[PDB]
Amino acid sequence: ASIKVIGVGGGGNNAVNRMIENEVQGVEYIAVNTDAQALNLSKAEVKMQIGAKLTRGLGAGANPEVGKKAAEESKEQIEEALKGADMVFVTAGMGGGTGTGAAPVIAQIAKDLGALTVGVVTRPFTFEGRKRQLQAAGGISAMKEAVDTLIVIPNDRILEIVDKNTPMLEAFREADNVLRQGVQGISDLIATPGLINLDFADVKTIMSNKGSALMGIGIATGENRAAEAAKKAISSPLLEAAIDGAQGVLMNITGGTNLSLYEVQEAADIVASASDQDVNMIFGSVINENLKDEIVVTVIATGFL
Ligand SMILES: Nc1nc2c(ncn2[C@@H]2O[C@H](COP(=O)(O)OP(=O)(O)OP(O)(O)=S)[C@@H](O)[C@H]2O)c(=O)[nH]1
């Protein structure tokens, strides 16, 4: 009922902006940064500057230690901001200083408060350099110890979706959109009750912080949309392990008012047919009025180990 989405650092805050612009509902947004300048470009209602004393508003200069200590300096404000949350999503681009360093601290505060804590983060593009990869790896494992589930999106695979024409700025806008889809694929099923009844217990069921969780997305229009989006999702480049490896699978099929009973059934059956015979699978369905002839299928795969 109290669902919070908390973006951390530049990348995460940009993802929270795409979410606000697509009027994702049912969630309270919070933006967190060590950089005061960037913070004021956030559209989130609550804007939290962390590590005022340590960084004086100037960012964490690409050092995860500073991001971590910034979030520790602001320990009590993060607690106040999150009090009463049943569920907390923590988004960030891993690789820099504030995301990598602060996101784990914020995730741990949320778990400690009893929130169901899901992380949704990206691993950086290979073109960003070995040092960004290293820093990111470090924060990804830190995050896994601090969340109930960590969804990890490998940015390189985004380049296998958008065309090879795409320059950096547009590539990163796509990353904001994958991050949004990872949060929203889950939050939409739980923010409001759908036509398929789907509760917290159902969602707790697919939660594992043992191994990075992975997501697949598929989008289609036209008369064969259900099967095409289901099939694309199970074949998403973002889904680096095959879906049959997963012990847990959440599936979100979203569509417009013409989303049909047979499509739901078809998409659910495709995804279940690709999955392990003993998978624990929870399916949800939501109507998005703004979609017209397009459907979206998201799968979150967990418990690969
Ligand atoms: N989704 C998204 N990801 C971004 C964007 N800009 C950079 N990234 C990714 O996130 C990673 C971290 O960058 P960023 O969020 O901007 O740093 P920061 O966490 O704020 O860290 P800092 O030291 O500058 S204070 C980058 O390595 C890159 O992969 C963006 O605008 N949107």
Residue numbers in the entry: 12 to 316
List sentences from the manuscript.
We examined three globular proteins from three phylogenetically disparate sources including: FtsZ, the cell division protein from B. subtilis; NS5B, the RNA-dependent RNA polymerase from Hepatitis C Virus; and P38α, a human protein kinase.
To determine if this was the case for the B. subtilis FtsZ structure, crystals of FtsZ:GDP were soaked in the presence of GTP-γ-S. The crystals (FtsZ:GSP) tolerated the soaks well and diffracted to the same resolution (2.45Ǻ) as FtsZ:GDP crystals. Also, residues Lys221 and Gly222 on chain B were disordered and were not modeled.
